[PDB]
Design a protein around this ligand. Structure first.
Ligand SMILES: C=C(/N=C/c1c(COP(=O)(O)O)cnc(C)c1O)C(=O)O
Ligand SMILES: C=C(/N=C/c1c(COP(=O)(O)O)cnc(C)c1O)C(=O)O
Ligand SMILES: Oc1ccnc2ccccc12
Ligand SMILES: Oc1ccnc2ccccc12
Ligand SMILES: [K+]
Ligand SMILES: [K+]
Lengths: 383, 384
């Protein structure tokens, strides 16, 4: 589970037995026709796959380009997270586990996990930073109705990083019964591989859909990147194809302000939540608090596969600010009638940063922005 | 003809007759135009997300000893079947040269769907909403603002859907040259009930193609909630006279014998409402009465004339469930399947407990998702 020098299994020793068990089970289902039948049936009828690739005519006219939106916002629960949550909770049920735990920032992973746990009849305990239980309270309501226990985390920054800390402590305390579901491609092997392999359906669909619209591969594919699961899913089938793959990190108040979540652009090599990867840290190796207007991107690390792609030049990375993402959120609502997630709005904001006159561009619309409605309107820049 | 047996017609002030004949003429022109349906079908597929899946609800099927399938209209863009009609009508408005859209809304799903379509086509949009539904469906009020629409709250009358539609029709009458009125249901003067039903019948045409690949035959039952009746008409129409038992479920409110409900077909009388001769909740003196329902989307005192005709000729069966039965089905689908249904659709799901379906194949129209209803459902005394 190494992507060049990145990745690995950097965990307390007690977890190695659990990770070896998970790796053996996963390798078992990768050749199991019955797993992929039930999983693909649920993706189609329960989640709503395949998602359409939508020609955004008014957006295209504004930029003089051909802009297509991969509509992951149309999935059940409203975000790409459901592709991963269904697959992993199914794997957990097949392994004999009876309990699910996870951390969540925007609440989209928590809702998707609680949804899969209700579908498969499993106990579910979701950890979420206290600050995020307010900015994304609508998702807290959904989780409780779906039968999950929501535990607010008041430690540290009280956001995603600290929720994951608590979920990992829960997992270690409950290894007998509990399967830990990471929401992104960050974690000890085999988790980054498992999550990416559940999300690459996005890129595989996109790869079959775009020739039907333009007769060729796109010029650009743009996706937002915090941990990196939605971007890994759409990028993976296109690696080394010649398409320009652009991952967009959260620039927060600005890359020079110290208030951002741009791990690849501003972090250093380090260890976080099981992975050797790029992490925002001070000069003494202490992990720093991240910041973003988007709770989903508010995380100080990045997936090890993206650190490897950045190093080898297979994917290009940049960042946009809070204000640029807010402008793109408003722009898509007005021009196309689609309210995007504030996470995905970072990708849409990057349309202003590339020379795309006459170019074919696919933007990964990773989720819908109903959860962000209150925080956008109350933001001082929008007011 | 615009008449479903004795129901329907164009019972409107004279000032609207000209606009309705122009609308009927324009609609007949596009009914044979392949350039219209190519653009409309492409938008349904890539923008709204059609076709929607037919989902086998395994845990729900186990509870009732049946084979229960959900038609997942909740997975459409904006989260409800209303988008099918709103896209088609705003497209018609574009081809007619209109520049402004107006409508009324109850649950906010039609207001959001209409504002969404107006944004897509770059049109001015003005939505009217009852003041009560402004506070009970506040999530949809915010969506409409960011989509670029103006939302006018209505404090008149019962401050719900009926009064909002009144104001929207008043808006249309005073803006007849630039404004296209988008009804949210199969209620209104001809040709609107036909137009709305012909946009919604894609639900049933898809269902008719999907159910044989799951069961090799037609279902025993198809169940859908009914207020105005557009989602039920959409799924029922391709199945009329097919031998399938078609069941429309009206809002029973606090009980059919309490006077606090919205069951127009079961407890209304023949009357005129918003252009249609149909069944309307009224007193013995012919005065329309206020409806009531825990669901804002079903809180309407009339019903579409095609459903009045279907009930009279026996082609569809109609019944009701109470507010409490709807809330139970809302919680049940959330816990058992991980699907949070609209409170409107929950009336159809609650009816699974009211018929003998042991060993039967049942399709339920899941007309929307219920994220808009979470605050209302939790704070309800029966749930608390
Ligand atoms: C942190 C969360 N959200 C992640 C997220 C992200 C960022 O996660 P990835 O970088 O793993 O795609 C992007 N888009 C949407 C709609 C998201 O919900 C969470 O839901 O817990
Ligand atoms: C009254 C509205 N909609 C009602 C509605 C209904 C009732 O409308 P029809 O009887 O026309 O299907 C059913 N299902 C959902 C999800 C709904 O939102 C409105 O949004 O204004
Ligand atoms: O484990 C996780 C759950 C939700 N979101 C996450 C984002 C980045 C890294 C890990 C995550
Ligand atoms: O005209 C309408 C707009 C929205 N909803 C409606 C529900 C029932 C009957 C008419 C309606
Ligand atoms: K990050
Ligand atoms: K009614």
């Amino acid at each position: 589970g190494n992507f060049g020098p990145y990745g690995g299994q950097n965990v307390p020793e007690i977890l190695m037995g659990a990770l070896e068990e998970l790796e053996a089970a996963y390798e078992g289902i990768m050749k199991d026709e019955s797993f992929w039948k039930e999983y693909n049936d649920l993706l189609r009828d329960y989640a709503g796959r395949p998602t359409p690739l939508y020609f955004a005519r008014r957006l295209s006219e504004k930029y003089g380009a051909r802009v297509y939106l991969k509509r992951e916002d149309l999935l059940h629960t409203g975000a790409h997270k459901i592709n991963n949550a269904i697959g992993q909770v199914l794997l957990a049920k097949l392994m004999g586990k009876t309990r699910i735990t996870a951390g969540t920032g925007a609440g989209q992973h928590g809702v998707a996990t609680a949804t899969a746990a209700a579908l498969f009849g499993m106990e579910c305990v979701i950890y979420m930073g206290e600050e995020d239980t307010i900015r994304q309270k609508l998702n807290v309501e959904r989780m409780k109705l779906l039968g999950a226990k929501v535990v607010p985390v008041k430690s540290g920054s009280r956001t995603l990083k600290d929720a994951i800390d608590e979920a990992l402590r829960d997992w270690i305390t409950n290894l007998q019964t509990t399967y830990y579901v990471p929401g992104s491609v960050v974690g000890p092997h085999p988790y980054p591989i498992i999550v990416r392999n559940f999300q690459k359906v996005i890129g595989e669909e996109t790869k079959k859909q775009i020739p039907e619209k333009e007769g060729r591969l796109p010029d650009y594919i743009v996706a937002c990147v915090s941990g990196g699961s939605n971007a890994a899913g759409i990028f993976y089938p296109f690696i080394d194809s010649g398409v320009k793959l652009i991952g967009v990190e959260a620039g927060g108040e600005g890359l020079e302000t110290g208030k951002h979540a741009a791990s690849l652009l501003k972090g250093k090599i380090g260890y976080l939540h099981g992975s050797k990867t790029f992490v925002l840290q001070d000069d003494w190796g202490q992990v720093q608090a991240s910041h973003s207007v988007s709770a989903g991107l508010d995380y100080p690390g990045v997936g090890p596969e993206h650190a490897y792609w950045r190093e080898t030049g297979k994917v290009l990375y940049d960042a946009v600010t809070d204000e640029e993402a807010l402008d793109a959120f408003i722009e898509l609502s007005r021009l196309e009638g689609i309210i995007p997630a504030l996470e995905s709005s970072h990708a849409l904001a990057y349309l202003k940063k590339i020379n795309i006159k006459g170019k074919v561009v696919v933007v990964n619309l990773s989720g819908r922005g109903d959860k962000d409605l209150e925080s956008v309107l109350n933001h001082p820049y929008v007011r």
